Design a protein around this nucleic acid. Structure first.
Ligand code: SF4
Ligand SMILES: [Mg+2]
Lengths: 435, 296
RNA sequence: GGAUACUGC
DNA sequence: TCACGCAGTATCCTGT
């Protein structure tokens, strides 16, 4: 309580009943609005991704609350100025978002849901003492029985609560609630009723609290939607509130580019066939998948690329996940023996399965007839002298030397400077030279 | 069967009466017949939704059984009018149908008793619930789901019930209350145990090998083997962790791999049974079983 | 690409 | 010395 504080913010949790009356700045208005929008969007995303009782949900929500500096934990110290500030934030931001989220029923529902979620989390973080404090400050009057009355009904209480020991019971304090709120407890006869009140010990209560909260909040949103014309005239706040819900708070595409320069001729042929027909026989699938694993395409990236490429081949989308997903996972050592299979070496490619009609895998220098290789080299604008030299090398059975000559000619380097013995080595050298 | 074999031998490579042409012709004619029948049904402005080499399913789009029967008769006669010895008959009236995929469906066959009354009998064709390679637990679950889907209860309630049952199953697995007999998977051997080159990858074969290593009667081609998937700390794939039930009851290091049974036996089956039903999707099912709904 | 199962009609 | 046909769905693996 430094300069201009008060008892306006007793507890962390609140039902947001009394609107703020202060005069704030436009900058503060915008900052609070955006911050609470971030908080609510985080709540929604975590609710979709995780189970709200999960520990991951709690950890991530605590991290977000700490990052945006919102009240989430109690403090048995006093009302420190900083704490006051945080609470003030929460109180103002909430109402600002109300103004933002009352125009359309959809929006209203969304707001309510997020708010309820947040409230539940915060309640889940309240110590029993704090919980009672809250239940008192809002006149919820859920009991707290006196010690004398507790001794008066000691035996009844002992027989009411399941698995409660004499001394342990002496160490516990109950609450008095109207039986209309403890339906789920009274119905199976697991809480004592006396004179219309149930005596409930210190999980379900949050539910009742939330019900009350939701009622109130819905009413409030209705009223806000009824008081909209007064705000639309304030241009300063119109761009924000009218559009808050739509407020912003290696790549597959470049692969084709790589195919222009870095890809060795084998991968270039495979990629050309794939983009021509959106389908590869098994050998091509294995070779190209291993190569794209080598360049660095992550499991998610490779899955996305293969899905997008194959979907155009007039096949069911589910068929891909049914069939080719396992192969893609296995190439990355995700299933089966779970081995990080290395990319094919040039020796393997040369000595691997021999390609046949309809296939495009293998080393072109070895699996392409000299006339076809000459035509392909001419197509790539290679100088006639370079094409002749490559053909001469091919006739010498040293296909790796032919690929080295290709690299030298295409990269405008007199000497390759490396012993090409892996397609990934080819791509790495090309990337080193270019980038 | 005898008659069918008298046909099939015509295309049996090692038969004394190999006449592949003839058999081909037979099949061809059959195809033609089916096509024609379908065309005729469509010319009658009905709807055809399935047919397997001699049959047609027609969506009567009616609820008056008598009228349906009338239509049956009518179309029956029409078809017969084109053939001399061939005949078509009403092979069943399904009150409800759940057509999932080619040669995989379930229905409630209607057996008439008289005076317009009729009884209903559950019939399944091709579903995993009628396959021996799935754990009995899962099968039962699926059966329950089918009984819920094919009934006349309001859809919402159906869904609710399904959820309840699935959660029950989850608990029964987590507490290990389910009888061990329900965790078994049965598979037959086409060859002898030794001929398989994947003694590790193939689970049933593995179990067979173990049995042959034990001191009892050996298992040979055609003998079904029952195995369970357990935990041993090996950190290997499920396919390599198969074990004979007795072994599980004997060794003190093996425990049933609850996760696996909840993740690859119950969930798949149920999902495939719930694919065309609105309101149930894989994710939800997984959630109801206690699995993580992230990777689903 | 391959291997292992078992349903149908 | 043997052994019926084909159409279709589901699961799993690819190091020396
Ligand atoms: S030598 Fe190696 S990198 Fe070059 S085309 Fe042949 S397989 Fe591909
Ligand atoms: Mg294929």
């Amino acid at each position: 309580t430094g300069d201009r504080k008060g008892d306006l913010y007793p507890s962390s949790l609140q039902f947001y009943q009394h609107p703020p009356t202060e005069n704030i700045s436009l900058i503060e208005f915008e900052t609070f609005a955006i911050e609470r929008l971030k908080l609510l969007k985080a709540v929604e995303n975590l609710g979709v991704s995780y189970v709200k009782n999960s520990e991951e949900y709690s950890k991530k929500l605590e991290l977000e609350l700490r990052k945006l500096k919102f009240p989430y934990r109690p403090l048995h110290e006093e009302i420190s100025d900083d704490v006051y500030d945080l609470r003030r934030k929460d109180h103002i931001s909430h109402f600002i978002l109300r103004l933002a989220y009352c125009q359309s029923e959809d929006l209203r529902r969304w707001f309510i849901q997020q708010e309820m979620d947040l409230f539940k989390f915060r309640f889940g973080l309240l110590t029993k003492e704090s919980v009672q404090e809250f239940l008192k400050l809002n006149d919820l009057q859920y009991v707290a029985i006196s010690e004398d009355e507790k001794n008066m009904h000691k035996e009844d209480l002992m027989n009411s609560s399941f698995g409660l020991s004499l001394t342990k019971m002496e160490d516990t304090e109950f609450y008095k609630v109207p039986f209309q709120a403890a339906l789920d407890l009274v119905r199976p006869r697991k809480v004592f009723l006396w004179r219309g009140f149930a005596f409930i010990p210190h999980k379900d209560i949050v539910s009742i609290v939330l019900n009350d909260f939701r009622a109130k909040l819905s009413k409030a949103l209705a009223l806000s939607a009824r008081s909209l014309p007064v705000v639309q005239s304030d241009e300063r706040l119109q761009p924000l509130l009218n559009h808050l819900s739509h407020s912003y708070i290696i790549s597959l595409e470049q692969i084709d580019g790589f195919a222009a320069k870095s890809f060795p001729l084998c991968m270039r042929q495979l990629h050309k066939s794939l983009r021509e027909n959106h389908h590869l026989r098994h050998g091509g699938r294995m070779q190209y998948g291993l190569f794209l694993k080598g360049i660095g395409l992550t499991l998610e990236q490779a899955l996305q690329f293969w899905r997008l490429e194959f979907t155009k081949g007039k096949v069911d989308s589910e068929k891909f996940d049914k069939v080719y997903a396992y192969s893609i996972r296995h190439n990355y050592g995700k299933e089966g023996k779970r081995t990080d299979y290395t990319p094919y070496s040039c020796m393997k490619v040369i000595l691997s399965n021999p390609p046949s009609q309809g296939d495009y895998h293998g080393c072109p220098f070895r699996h392409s007839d000299p006339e076809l290789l000459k035509q392909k080299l001419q197509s790539f604008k290679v100088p006639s002298s370079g094409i002749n030299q490559i053909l001469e090398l091919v006739k010498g059975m040293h296909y790796q030397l032919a690929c080295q000559k290709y690299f030298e000619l295409t990269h405008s380097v007199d000497d390759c400077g490396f012993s090409l013995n892996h397609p990934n080595q080819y791509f790495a050298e090309s990337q080193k030279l270019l980038t | 069967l005898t008659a069918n074999s008298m046909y099939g031998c015509l295309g049996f490579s090692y038969s004394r009466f190999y006449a592949k042409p003839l058999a081909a012709l037979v099949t061809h004619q059959g195809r033609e017949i089916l096509l024609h029948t379908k065309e005729m049904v469509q010319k009658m402005n009905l709807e055809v939704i399935y047919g397997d080499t001699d049959s047609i399913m027609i969506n009567t789009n009616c609820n008056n059984l008598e009228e349906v029967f009338k239509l049956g008769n009518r179309v029956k006669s029409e078809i017969n009018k084109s053939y001399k010895l061939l005949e078509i008959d009403i092979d069943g009236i399904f009150k409800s149908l759940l057509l999932l995929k080619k040669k995989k469906y379930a229905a409630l066959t209607v057996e008439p008793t008289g005076d317009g009354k009729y009884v209903t009998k559950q019939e399944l064709k091709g579903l995993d619930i009628v396959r021996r390679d799935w754990c009995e637990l899962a099968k039962q679950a699926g059966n329950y789901v089918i009984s819920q889907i094919l009934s006349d209860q309001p859809r919402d309630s159906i869904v609710e019930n399904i959820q309840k049952k699935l959660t029950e199953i989850g608990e029964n697995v987590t507490n290990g209350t389910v009888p061990i007999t329900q965790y078994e998977i049965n598979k037959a051997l086409t060859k002898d145990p030794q001929d398989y080159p994947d003694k590790k990858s193939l689970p049933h074969v593995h179990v067979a090998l173990w049995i042959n290593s034990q001191g009892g009667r050996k298992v040979k081609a055609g003998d079904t083997i029952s195995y369970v998937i357990c935990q041993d700390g090996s950190n290997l794939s499920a396919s390599q962790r198969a074990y004979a039930q007795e072994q599980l009851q004997k060794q003190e290091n093996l425990s049933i791999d609850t996760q696996y049974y909840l993740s690859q036996q119950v969930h798949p089956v149920v999902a495939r049974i719930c694919e065309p039903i609105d309101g149930i999707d894989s994710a939800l099912i997984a959630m109801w079983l206690g699995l993580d709904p992230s990777q689903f």
